[PDB]
């Protein structure tokens, strides 16, 4: 059928978790970068963005917007959303925790200059005291290589992605969590994920001041 086509700007932002999930699933996809406000405005005008926002992914005849809609579909299509309703419940609880922490970190460079330092410290206390203990506890509960059902799921991929971002923020936050470190290593060594982590893949770099200014002139904030 059609190769999925990912519409976003040339940055991580809200599309990166999708690039991770598709890559991990071994699914070939294409990207179409929005480079100007005019590119975005054409997509809006032409009715391809339900809420006038991206990310948008063209897949299986849909113009799918909303990150969780995109990810839920891709996870189901490629058997990374568990085997039944009860496994999906555990997966959803786990990844919604990942989303909450992820969202905090995502928005840190948006924080007013004089609130930024205190926001970082609150994120670090949450990582150390709430999120990393919760996920370490799951991995210690069963002692297995994957978070849910002894099988690779989206939860492992989303979690490992976030451990990369936490590492960029402060490399010591993970030090007291040996099962999380071991998960990061194993998932990073899955053939598909390894290729994703290697140069020339669609994986995107940390946003710098000049990619931030591009966001500003496209999405106008």
Ligand X SMILES: N[C@@H](CCC(=O)N[C@@H](CS)C(=O)NCC(=O)O)C(=O)O
Shortest Å distance, C-beta 83 to ligand X: 24
Nearer to its own copies, 38 or 60 (CB): 60
Stretch that binds its own copies, among 27-35, 68-76, 201-209, 212-220 (CB under 8 A): 68-76
Q: What is the DSSP string of 33-100?
A: E--SHHHHHHHHHTT--TTS-S-EEEETTEEEESHHHHHHHHHHHTT-S-SSHHHHHHHHHHHHHHHH
Residue 54 binds which of ligand X, its own copies, none (CB < 5-8 A, kind-dependent) = ligand X
| Of 116, 55, 67, the residue nearest 96 (C-alpha) | 67
Site residues for ligand X, window 62-101 (CB under 6 A)?
66-67, 96, 100
Stretch that binds its own copies, among 15-23, 73-81, 102-110, 205-213 (CB under 8 A): 73-81
Query: For residues 17 and 210, is the Cβ–Cβ distance under 8 A?
Result: no
Strand pairing category for 5-8 and 30-33: parallel
**Structure token digits, residue 62:** 């849909």
Strand pairing category for 56-59 and 5-8: antiparallel
- Interface size with ligand X, residues (CB under 6 A): 11
Using CA atoms, how far apart are residues 114 and 136, in angstroms rounded to an integer?
33
Return binding residues.
Answer: 8, 44, 53-54, 66-67
Residues that bind its own copies (CB under 8 A): 50-52, 60, 62, 64-69, 72-73, 76-77, 85-86, 88-90, 92-94, 96-97, 100, 130-131, 134
Residues that bind ligand X (CB under 6 A): 13-14, 52-55, 66-67, 96, 100, 219
């Amino acid at each position: 059928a059609e190769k999925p086509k990912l519409h976003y700007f040339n940055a991580r932002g809200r599309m990166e978790s999708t690039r991770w999930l598709l890559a991990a699933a071994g699914v070939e996809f294409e990207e179409k970068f929005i480079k100007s406000a005019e590119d975005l405005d054409k997509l809006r005008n032409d009715g391809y963005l339900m809420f006038q926002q991206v990310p948008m992914v063209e897949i299986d005849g849909m113009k799918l917007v909303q990150t969780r809609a995109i990810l839920n579909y891709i996870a189901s299509k490629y058997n990374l959303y568990g085997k039944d309703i009860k496994e999906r419940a555990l997966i959803d609880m786990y990844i919604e925790g990942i989303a909450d922490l992820g969202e905090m970190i995502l928005l840190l460079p948006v924080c007013p200059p004089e609130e930024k330092d205190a926001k970082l410290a609150l994120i670090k206390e949450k990582i150390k005291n709430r999120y990393f203990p919760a996920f370490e506890k799951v991995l210690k509960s069963h002692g297995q290589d994957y978070l849910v059902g002894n099988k690779l799921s989206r939860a492992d991929i989303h979690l490992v992605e976030l451990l990369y971002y936490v590492e960029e923020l402060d490399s010591s936050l993970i030090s007291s969590f040996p099962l999380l470190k071991a998960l990061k290593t194993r998932i990073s060594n899955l053939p598909t994920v390894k290729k994703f982590l290697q140069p020339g893949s669609p994986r995107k770099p940390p946003m710098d001041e000049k990619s931030l200014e591009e966001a500003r002139k496209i999405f106008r904030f």
